[PDB]
Design a protein around this ligand. Structure first.
Ligand SMILES: [Ca+2]
Ligand SMILES: [Ca+2]
Ligand SMILES: [Ca+2]
Ligand SMILES: [Ca+2]
Ligand SMILES: [Ca+2]
Ligand SMILES: [Ca+2]
Ligand SMILES: [Ca+2]
Ligand SMILES: [Ca+2]
Ligand SMILES: [Ca+2]
Ligand SMILES: [Ca+2]
Ligand SMILES: [Ca+2]
Ligand SMILES: [Ca+2]
Ligand SMILES: [Ca+2]
Ligand SMILES: [Ca+2]
Lengths: 74, 78, 78, 74
């Protein structure tokens, strides 16, 4: 019911809106990826600190067990 | 009482659960991105096809006006 | 070695963190619902207004056809 | 460029699609709410079991401390 010229201008506006919206969404992905990488890195560092402490504690237990055994069996 | 080794094992499991949840949340975000990307392509394709059809009809409309004014000019001379 | 009381305190904190995350995820889902509800109202309103305008124009179109056929009938008798 | 009758039928289809889609979304909220309530309930029960065990352990520590004190100060 509107002229073809008017309808062409309406659809062009729809295109520009979708393009501008998607461009924005795409431009934001890098910072989101960077945030996940940063936070996963923090968690892996936390896990590695716990794991390392567990390794140390297990070696101390090995040494305590060996010492008690040697004292008891001579 | 209990061993610190046991407590450290438990704390390592706690952080492993957090890592697994973060990795799975990120994997989900990537799936949502893929579906968004494909939907954009479908939808922008529909819009560009509609725009080109309107554009082609508008070109035809201007030529129809040219033809109709030419026919009037010929009618005036009759 | 360490006390089981300390280990239990730590485990209680671990579950409290999970509760807090679940409560906040649910609070987020409710916010998304509210925005969805309001968007539905905006969008269905636009559609019903468009439908009523088309409907009213169609009623007018049928009456215009009635008027145009009546005028033809009067022209035929001239 | 289409007749008003055709356009009325197109918009009616759009309405029915939006209504049917929203009705579905609304009908699904109860099961989602129920799932959150169920899972939060499981977590609170887990937390209460830990808390209760901590209360018991603290009372045992109170009794061990009192007994050692009495033995040492007579
Ligand atoms: Ca038109
Ligand atoms: Ca238009
Ligand atoms: Ca390590
Ligand atoms: Ca813990
Ligand atoms: Ca398609
Ligand atoms: Ca499509
Ligand atoms: Ca073209
Ligand atoms: Ca824990
Ligand atoms: Ca509105
Ligand atoms: Ca609106
Ligand atoms: Ca009406
Ligand atoms: Ca029309
Ligand atoms: Ca139509
Ligand atoms: Ca309790």
């Amino acid at each position: 019911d509107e002229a073809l010229e008017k309808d062409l201008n309406d659809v062009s506006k729809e295109i520009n809106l979708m393009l501008s919206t998607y461009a924005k969404l795409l431009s934001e992905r890098a910072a989101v990826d960077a945030s996940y990488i940063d936070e996963i890195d923090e968690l892996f560092k936390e896990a590695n600190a716990i794991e390392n402490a567990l390794i140390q504690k297990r070696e101390e237990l090995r040494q305590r067990f060996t010492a008690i055994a040697n004292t008891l069996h001579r």
